[PDB]
């Protein structure tokens, strides 16, 4: 009876205070088994547990006078159990109760008490952390952590185990307990820790997860975490963990999609992206997208109707964006007089469109070759710039033709030709960190005694070639270009691109530079503060640190240098928030509030702030405010809004946003600059007929540094859009960070094979247990499809086992004999 249980409690307490050793042991064991039975229903605060609250001081007093190590050891355990309802936080009762005795194998107790002691361990560990600034030792906590972690790992407490190892900050002991069935969920719950968890423990989490994956031979995710970390020797170790050549090819495909120049023999073709052109033409054949689309087909001006040079420039840009990679067009390839319709700088982009169409294809060099012989310097510059785009992101193992043809024209005295040469060098070798390109550009670049436009564009090329992991020589050269030049030149818009080039070098790491910030802080030029904040926030991109956002807003709250720093502020907050999608959604409201109370210089970027943050995913709540600000005053604001639409709708072929853009084309038709940028946004909207996007971060949250670099390159100076209206050659920078977006079920031999692919909205596997599905709203779609931003893939068929778990990009399959 329950009253009999209360009598049991009282009598057992009396026998515990009864000094007899036999009574000691009898009452101790009986109360142990009773509190074990008190946990029969571990809910509703059991009545025996409630009645144990007045007893706990009696057990404490009895223990104080107890001197029986063979019996007080278990009474310490009993006191630990009874310390649960004896909350009195800050007294750390049950933890020290679990000490002394060597019976700390508490597996016989319920989940509630173990969870409570884990929480108390976390609280007292925070108390120790503050105790180690301004009792249980650090090693003392391990005595119980090394028991709790196996307990959680056995009883599906993977999330709890990771949480405890994080709060104890001893995650390096995690791999000693990992089972072959436990690793996958632990890592899936653990790879998501990096973006939100405060540094520098993010690198520790990445390294620990990498160690878990390597021991389990699941290199599919491990290569992604290696790319996140950026340690080349780590990628090498991943490679040495594989003996099957097929896994080598698939890792090569993954890192080629990441555009990372890792050198490996016998694989160099795949990592060099040399098979991308054939894959894309196969995609065009399979999707019946071979038929080129006229820029008029994009405009559809015939349905909506009752300077020729600028409209021709817009049409050329649209055509270049449309037929990119398909190697066929009818507007420019067959019409040589078409180039002559464009005047001045328009001739350059005209020929550059051919290189854009022949992107990733070495075939285009023949077509671009003929326009090199034309004596007009603009035509030569356009063809020479298009040469790089025709081989952009493509690197054969031995001798790049683009480098050979490009190196001669860099030293040309013409500003336009040399500018096109350095721009093409940056485009072709973006993300490769090419050593020959290093040794060519580094003396060619910097050159503080050269035209500032050429120096700035060479610096942009340097930044595109070397992205992330920083570089001392490039930083020193850029700071040499920061020396003084002349006071008037420091006010020119070109120095903005130099600042961006300096910033790009550190964007990958974050919290790692920590030194150049002081060097920038040691210079008192008026523009120096803007460069400081731009670079500092650009380095932290992909993390989401909030204190930096507070600093940026404090900068925002209230002359050319002031305009530039206020300009870099919003770009910086956008880049920092461009991590977890929760920061994305908060940054939306941030930009809204800033647009509410903002000066006119900061007014014409909030659109761009939405665009870069929400690129390639046309979410409903993004473009409506953009449309609101499109009809607003400050024409530059409208141009920025429509370009933010273009970035937001990059490659998605969103008919709704296309209708909005056409309506804006009807409205902003009087101002020809607005019409030109509207047509550019139209061309970017349907980029590559929908088979290619500007997505900054892919599945598993890898960071395409080249794509972000291109977006920042096109958004840095467009606070004064007239500059890029004059120099539109930088609008081909999107072709550096551009990539296809598709699936391709490559056979083991290396040919595509049809297979059912399950496509639906992505869902995270964090709190769900068992084996929940990663796909919501599946479509049983066949071989190559176009998964938009926000969808994963998974093989419906039981057979055709994919070596890589993450089904995106190129995928190789094997025939599982089952079924």
């Amino acid at each position: 009876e329950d009253a009999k249980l209360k009598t049991d409690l009282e009598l057992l307490v009396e026998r515990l205070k009864e000094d007899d050793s036999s009574l000691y042991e009898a009452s101790l064991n009986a109360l142990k088994e009773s509190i074990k039975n008190s946990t029969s229903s571990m809910t509703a605060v059991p009545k025996p547990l409630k009645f144990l609250r007045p007893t706990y001081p009696d057990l404490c007093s009895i223990y104080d006078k107890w001197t029986d190590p063979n019996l007080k050891s278990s009474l310490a355990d009993v006191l630990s159990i009874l310390a649960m309802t004896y909350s009195e936080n800050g007294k750390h009762d049950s933890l020290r109760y679990r000490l002394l005795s060597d019976v700390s194998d508490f597996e016989g107790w319920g989940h509630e008490y173990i969870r409570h002691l884990a929480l108390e361990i976390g609280e007292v560990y925070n108390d120790q952390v503050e105790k180690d600034a301004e009792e249980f030792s650090k090693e003392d906590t391990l005595r119980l952590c090394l028991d709790i972690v196996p307990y959680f790992l056995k009883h599906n407490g993977e999330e709890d185990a990771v949480d405890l190892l994080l709060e104890i900050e001893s995650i390096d002991k995690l791999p000693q307990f990992v089972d072959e069935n436990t690793f996958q969920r632990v890592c899936q719950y653990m790879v998501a820790c990096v973006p939100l968890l405060p540094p520098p423990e993010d690198v520790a989490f990445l390294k620990t997860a990498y160690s878990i994956y390597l021991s389990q031979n699941e290199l599919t995710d491990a290569i992604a975490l290696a790319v996140r970390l950026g340690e080349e020797d780590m990628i090498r170790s991943v490679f040495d963990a594989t003996s099957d050549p097929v896994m080598h090819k698939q890792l090569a495909y993954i890192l080629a999609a990441q555009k990372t120049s890792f050198e490996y023999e016998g694989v160099q073709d795949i990592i060099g992206n040399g098979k991308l052109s054939e894959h894309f033409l196969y995609l065009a054949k399979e999707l019946n997208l071979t038929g080129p689309k006229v820029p008029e087909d994009i405009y559809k001006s015939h349905l909506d109707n009752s300077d020729s040079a600028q409209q021709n420039l817009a049409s050329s840009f649209v055509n270049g964006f449309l037929n990119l990679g398909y190697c066929n067009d009818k507007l420019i390839v067959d019409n040589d007089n078409w180039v002559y319709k464009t005047k001045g700088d328009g001739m350059t982009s005209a020929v550059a469109s051919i290189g854009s169409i022949y992107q990733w294809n070495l075939d285009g060099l023949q077509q671009l070759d003929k326009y090199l012989y034309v004596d007009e310097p603009e035509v030569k510059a356009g063809a020479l710039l298009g040469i790089g785009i025709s081989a952009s992101g493509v690197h054969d193992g031995e001798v790049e033709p683009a480098l050979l043809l490009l190196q001669d024209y860099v030293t040309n005295p013409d500003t336009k030709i040399s500018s096109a040469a350095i721009l093409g060098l940056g485009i072709a070798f973006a993300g490769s960190k090419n050593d020959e390109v290093l040794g060519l550009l580094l003396p060619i670049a910097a050159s503080t005694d050269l035209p500032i436009e050429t120096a700035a564009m060479a610096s942009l090329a340097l930044a595109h070639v070397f992205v992330g992991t920083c570089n001392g020589d490039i930083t020193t050269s850029i700071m040499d270009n920061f020396l003084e030049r002349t006071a008037i030149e420091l006010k020119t818009d070109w120095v903005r691109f130099l600042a961006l080039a300096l910033g790009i070098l550190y964007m990958g790491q974050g919290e790692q530079v920590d030194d150049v910030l002081e060097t920038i802080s040691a210079i008192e030029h008026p523009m120096t503060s803007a460069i400081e904040v731009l670079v500092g926030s650009c380095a932290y991109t992909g993390t989401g640190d909030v204190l930096l956002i507070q600093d940026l807003l404090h900068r925002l709250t209230p002359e050319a240098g002031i305009v530039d720093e206020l300009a870099y502020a919003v770009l910086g907050i956008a880049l920092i928030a461009l991590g977890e999608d929760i920061g994305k959604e908060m940054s939306l409201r941030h930009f809204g509030h800033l647009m509410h109370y903002g000066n006119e210089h900061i007014r014409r970027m909030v659109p761009l702030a939405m665009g870069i943050v929400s690129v390639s995913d046309p979410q409903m709540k993004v473009f409506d405010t953009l449309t609101r600000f499109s009809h607003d005053a400050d024409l530059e604001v409208s141009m920025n809004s429509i370009f933010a639409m273009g970035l937001c709708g990059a490659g998605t072929n969103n008919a709704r946003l296309a209708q909005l853009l056409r309506q804006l084309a009807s409205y902003y038709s009087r101002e020809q600059d607005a019409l030109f940028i509207t047509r550019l946004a139209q061309g970017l909207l349907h980029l590559g007929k929908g088979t290619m996007t500007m997505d900054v971060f892919n599945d598993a949250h890898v960071l395409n540094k080249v794509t972000l670099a291109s977006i920042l390159t096109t958004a840095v100076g467009l606070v004064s859009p007239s500059f890029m209206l004059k120099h539109h050659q930088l609008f081909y920078m999107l072709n550096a960070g551009i990539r296809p977006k598709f699936i391709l079920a490559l056979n083991d031999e290396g040919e595509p094979i049809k297979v059912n692919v399950r496509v639906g909205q992505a869902v995270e596997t964090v709190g769900q247990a068992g084996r929940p599905k990663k796909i919501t709203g599946w479509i049983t779609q066949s071989t190559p499809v176009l998964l938009n931003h926000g969808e994963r893939a998974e093989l419906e068929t039981d057979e055709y086992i994919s070596y890589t778990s993450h089904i995106e990009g190129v995928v190789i399959l094997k025939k599982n004999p089952d079924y």
């Binding site: 019946n288 059912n756 066949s782």
Partner: protein
């Protein structure tokens, strides 16, 4: 694809029925997961629409009124 053959095998059908034939031909490829609709698909679609949905036809009564 043989557009002449498809047009011939559809006598006395108003343009709305041709539009519906095009829509159903597009649909039948989707149900078979094929991303391209072929002639064999168009023939099935035109049979289903013109022949199957013939009792619910409007162009045979209203012609008399005209």
């Amino acid at each position: 694809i043989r557009w002449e053959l498809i047009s011939r095998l559809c006598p006395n059908s108003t343009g709305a029925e041709l539009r519906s034939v095009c829509t159903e031909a597009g649909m039948f490829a989707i149900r078979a997961r094929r991303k391209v609709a072929t002639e064999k698909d168009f023939l099935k679609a035109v049979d289903k629409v013109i022949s199957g949905y013939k009792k619910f036809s409007s162009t045979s009564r209203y012609m008399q009124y005209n």
